[PDB]
Ligand binder design. Sequence first.
Ligand SMILES: CC(C)=CCC/C(C)=C/CC/C(C)=C/CC/C(C)=C/CC/C(C)=C/CC/C(C)=C/CC/C(C)=C/CC/C(C)=C/COP(=O)(O)OP(=O)(O)O
Length: 176
Amino acid sequence: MKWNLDPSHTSIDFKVRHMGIASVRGSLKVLSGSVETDEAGRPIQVEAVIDAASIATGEPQRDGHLRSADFLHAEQYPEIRFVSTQIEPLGGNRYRIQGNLTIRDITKPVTLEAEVSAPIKDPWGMQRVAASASGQINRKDWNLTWNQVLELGALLVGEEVKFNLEVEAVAPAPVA
Ligand SMILES: CC(C)=CCC/C(C)=C/CC/C(C)=C/CC/C(C)=C/CC/C(C)=C/CC/C(C)=C/CC/C(C)=C/CC/C(C)=C/COP(=O)(O)OP(=O)(O)O
């Protein structure tokens, strides 16, 4: 069965190390996505489209820099895209999702560790299901570089981008 991601209750949150002593946190908004489940209700395929211009870290000048031609170039590349290539059930509600993540013109493999909830009938007719997932990427894999950075050799802006997803997905009534 096909579930559609609800952009209003899906969150993408990320963290990057700053000067080795702290983290900068940010978010991205999802535009759309879906999950297909097999007869057993295990997720088999998942895809999402993310609004690149939505990147937000709570400082407008920094967010401008992130969106600029110097970094994400969100005017030329309005989306970040994820498409799964393999989903492995791990037991219980756990799944490992391998997929391809596109940022600008570069696509690289990423791994998500996901946990899925039991579906509910929501207060408005629809079937609704949630999931949480975690992972990390190295921004340099997408040629997203930063600076002349110097501290001891250390980094102003870390290479690793840790992220957490909270997802809600929906399907029509007992009838699709
Ligand atoms: C059944 C069911 C519901 C199943 C569900 C399945 C499921 C889990 C589906 C999920 C669908 C989705 C949404 C999948 C998404 C997949 C993935 C991997 C998404 C990843 C998104 C992501 C994190 C993209 C990140 C891109 C980047 C490059 C972020 C970069 C952040 C960055 C470098 C920030 C700057 C931070 C540093 C510290 C700046 C310092 O600031 P400052 O000192 O002021 O400097 P300046 O001002 O100069 O900028």
